[PDB]
Amino acid sequence: GTIDPQNSEEHPVLSRRLEN
Numbered sequence: 001g002t003i004d005p006q007n008s009e010e011h012p013v014l015s016r017r018l019e020n
Contacts, residue, residue, distance in 0.1 A: 001009055001016070008017030 001011065001013075003009060003016035003018035005014075006017030007015045009015045
């Protein structure tokens with residue numbers, strides 16, 4: 001949660017990742 005359309009959010013949902 002709270003990230004871009006990438007891989008990271010291991011949670012039971014659409015993965016997402018965000019950074020600088």
